[PDB]
Amino acid sequence: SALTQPPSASGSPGQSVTISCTGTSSDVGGSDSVSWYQQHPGKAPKLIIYEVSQRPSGVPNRFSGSKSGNTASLTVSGLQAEDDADYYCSSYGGDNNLFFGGGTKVTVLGQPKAAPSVTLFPPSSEELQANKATLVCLISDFYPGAVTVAWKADSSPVKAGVETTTPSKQSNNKYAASSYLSLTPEQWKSHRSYSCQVTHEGSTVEKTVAPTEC
Amino acid sequence: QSALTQPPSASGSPGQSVTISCTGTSSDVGGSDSVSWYQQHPGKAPKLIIYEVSQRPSGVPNRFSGSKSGNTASLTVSGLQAEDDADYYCSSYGGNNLFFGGGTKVTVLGQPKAAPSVTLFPPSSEELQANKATLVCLISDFYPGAVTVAWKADSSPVKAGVETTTPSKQSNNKYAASSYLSLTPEQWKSHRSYSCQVTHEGSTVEKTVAPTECS
């Protein structure tokens, strides 16, 4: 039996948002065992409130928890991009039962546009010794999290051997991805250069690398 | 690092059994019979599946069993079913605070296992000229799509400046990710080496790179 949370809530940077967690007299209304967890997709939930109002060590004083009757509430003030996450409440009930809310996705509205930083790496000596010549185009610090990548061998398009990872949000709240091109040492040494062209929000960043002169 | 230690992953095929551990100290896991286990499917609420070491809440099948020996609690899932593929967490009371593990991803194998290809790249000449010395540890062609990365500066663990992408399925239906360490040129040039350690299916692969006079 789930506790009741709104599926979504939102706020702009620096604003406050309050989200609720409705249970029954025998769980939320029954004791001070209400906890709140903040979870970024693909990461473990982080405890932000326990015993209705208590913050663990390291949780900013911007997160406040309270309860009135059968409804617990979490308020997040001075919203920051890192606060954009899923929030789950829980409460013990009778008979060793532990109830969880269905989660609230809190959206921090209007986050700033950010162009990608692109760094193109030529093949490592270890992999060239291992008869491999992979290039990696590291793409970081971009927002929103959608990019397209094209590769060139000299000035010509590369139509095979390309993989680009699905962008993931990193600790600076901006996206990262890597495009990698698996070349043979012969393909790498036979061209004057390779280039990675990253398109983000209609603007392209191009980087070029060439076989070592060392 | 979480208060209790759980292995980052486990796997098995349908019908197999898996056992996952949760290690603490004598003041938490080994001090009482208060270990709880929680199951969580991506994008869904966690669910309590074991409490007080061995107790199953109503409706949790007997395929799930919990035990404890000294400072280590264990959860066994027998006859693995598709619905068991999830993240599993433990918790315990401590000397009367609550301590948690960092979670174990349990994968019900959907295709053959595949060990990752790990390629470690030193700083590129262009970024060094731009006063950056980012290293990239490319990890590809692995299954299950669960990986843990750690970096070392010489033999010392380095946590600061590390970012690792969430694994994503590539055109060959295997996973890829990259881990990048944002060093300054001073940090890069002043150490003997830097290493990328990739853990997958309980085994660790390490790659090391060191500065050169010419890039």
Numbering used by the authors:
A (entry chain B): 2 to 215
B (entry chain A): 1 to 95, 97 to 216
Paper text:
LCs were distributed in two groups: a set of eight amyloidogenic LCs responsible for severe cardiac involvement and symptoms in patients (hereafter, H LC), and a set of five non amyloidogenic LCs isolated from patients affected by multiple myeloma for which no amyloid aggregation or proteotoxicity was observed in patients (hereafter, M LC). Five H LCs (H3, H6, H7, H9 and H10) and two M LCs (M7 and M8) were successfully crystallized and their 3D-structures solved. The crystal structures were all refined to satisfactory refinement parameters; in all cases the LCs were dimeric, with an overall quaternary arrangement closely matching that of the previously reported LC dimers. VL and CL domains display very different structural properties in the seven crystal structures. CL domains (res 115–214) are typically characterized by high quality electron density, are all very well superposable, and the dimeric CL–CL arrangement is clearly conserved in all the analysed structures (root mean square deviations -r.m.s.d.- generally fall below 1.0 Å over the entire CL–CL dimer - Table S3A and Fig. 4B-bottom).
Each of the seven LCs crystallized in a different space group, with distinct crystal packing; the crystallographic resolutions achieved ranged from 2.70 Å (H7) to 1.65 Å (H9). Mass spectrometry and non-reducing SDS-PAGE indicated that 100% of the LC dimers were covalently linked by a disulphide bond located at the chain C-terminus (data not shown). However, due to underlying local flexibility, only for H9 a well-defined electron density for such C-terminal intermolecular disulphide bond is visible. In H6 and M8 dimers all six CDRs (three for each LC monomer) are traceable in the electron density; in H9 and H10 five out of six are traceable, in H7 three, and in H3 and M7 only two CRDs are traceable. In some cases (H6, H9, H10) CDR3 (residues 89–97) participates in the interface; both CDR3s in the H7 dimer lack electron density, while in M7 and M8 CDR3 residues are located far from the VL–VL interface. Analysis of the data shows that the kinetics of proteolysis correlate well with amyloid propensity: H3, H6, H7, H9, and H16 are almost or totally proteolysed after 60 minutes, and more than 50% of H10, H15 and H18 LCs is cleaved after three hours. Inspection of the SDS-PAGE gels shows that the proteolysis pattern is different in different H LCs, suggesting that the sequence of proteolytic events, and not only their kinetics, may be characteristic of each H LC.
